[PDB]
């Protein structure tokens, strides 16, 4: 987009700095905030990934929840050693959505459905 | 201190004793705070009470 990019717009670099600061202070990546109960396609995208990546995801989530309960933040060195925005989930999610659309176009039933609450 | 341990061994090896202790403490503390608040109330404003009007018995 012409104005979403941080390269050409000065009101997006500030946004990414804020988000990166808030993600680092708890030590978790931007793709960790996607929930498998929310979209029901994140569930498949995560189901198809290798085991070690998902295990690292679970460990990071537990670390952040412990930090929040204790009301503190990671030390400065373990804050320097942090990389948010290093995705592991975008491409698989896009691929799953592409197959979903292509199956919808040519007739075809859905593969999994949200449950009525 | 050691008095806390002595109180603990005296009162809490059973439970019915604990219930009785709680009830007794309640119905003693109630009286104590009643006495304290009544006394402070009397002290704060002297001369205004009903038994302090100088003409209470001169409408016979």
């Amino acid at each position: 987009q012409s104005f979403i990019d941080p390269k050409k717009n000065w009101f997006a670099a500030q946004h990414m700095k804020a988000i990166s600061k808030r993600l680092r202070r708890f030590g978790l990546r931007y793709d960790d905030l996607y929930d498998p109960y929310y979209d029901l396609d994140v569930k498949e995208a995560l189901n198809r990934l290798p085991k070690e990546v998902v295990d690292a995801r679970h460990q990071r989530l537990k670390r952040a929840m412990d930090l929040s309960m204790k009301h503190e933040y990671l030390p400065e060195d373990l804050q320097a050693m942090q990389t948010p925005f290093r995705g592991y989930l975008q491409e698989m999610l896009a691929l799953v959505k592409r197959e979903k659309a292509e199956r919808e176009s040519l007739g075809g039933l859905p593969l999994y459905q949200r449950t009525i609450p | 201190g050691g008095i806390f341990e002595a109180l603990y061994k005296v009162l809490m090896r059973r439970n019915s004793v604990y219930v009785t202790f709680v009830i007794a403490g309640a119905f003693v503390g109630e009286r104590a705070v009643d006495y304290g608040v009544h006394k402070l109330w009397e002290h704060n404003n002297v001369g205004k009470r009903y038994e302090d009007i100088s003409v209470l018995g001169q409408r016979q």
Partner: protein, 386 residues
Amino acid sequence: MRNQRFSLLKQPISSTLNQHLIDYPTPSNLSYWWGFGSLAGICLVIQIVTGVFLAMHYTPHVDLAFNSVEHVMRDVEGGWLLRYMHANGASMFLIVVHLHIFRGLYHASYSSPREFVRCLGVVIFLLMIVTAFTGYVPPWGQMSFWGATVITSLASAIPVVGDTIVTWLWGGFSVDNATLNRFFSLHHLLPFILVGASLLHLAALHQYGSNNPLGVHSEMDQISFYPYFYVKDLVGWVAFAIFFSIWIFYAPNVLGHPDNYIPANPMPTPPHIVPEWYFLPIHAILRSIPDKSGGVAAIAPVFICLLALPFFKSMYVRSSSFRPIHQGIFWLLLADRLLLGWIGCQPVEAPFVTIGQIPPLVFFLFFAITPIPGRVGRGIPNSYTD
């Protein structure tokens, strides 16, 4: 199976209470903003008990209602305590539920999979408003009479059916004894429906668990409910009791209008008619329009937007901690909602017409704007990636 019994707390008799109160798993980083649901439950119970004991000394007739309320306060042992608890616990109950709603708005609790909970909450809010308004009448003062007149005659603005439904509602040609007795029966009935809706609300929440100040998956680190959140609820309850009793014992009339100590007189009108303090935002939105049909049908967008928030389906991050712009919009909406509240208690002239017409515009731009962040931020991973 366990071919011999272990615990009373896992037997069939206590299975429901155990599973939904004692052993239920909750996130371990819930803060103090998660106690107001239980606190509101206790407020509802207080209202019900106090009302069942007031209704033993009150007579619903136009000749007797005012004098029966004063008889309660002057001639029954402790009756003043009952009346003050009731008339101030309504205000406490509204305060607590407002804080609950704004908690839900902050950490974005309406999104999937928790939109049934939000919809049931909105229905509960409607029942609460109806119950309080119906029950402000039975004392039969000046504001009772004239507030009932204004609000229930606001229903003749509707096309052709208007006068018919107003006359059927009033039971006659004006607000009189029939309306009083009718409203008393409705007031005694509605809170039990409120109880039922609350229990359904809780079941709907327990079928997926609660959110947390982070808005992430939370199935790896959970703790039971007892004794870890029971003690936190206890702290909340004791603080609430201190506040409630400061209201009851040392300032029991600050939260009311003085005019309700004058018996109803249909001929003279008060110079400044307003309802209670917790209907003033709706009242200001309602008088903000110079048209009856528009004014009445502007409340409908309020409830439609509140009931249609959950169904926007692009936003991916729930908590406002990682969303600066939506956080700022939340605070600005709070300020605007307070401004509506203050305006709803003023005379209708300059300079209050403009300041009563713009805040509704902001209150609707809130429910219009939020999907735009949804879309514009769905594509955020692709731009900021490292």
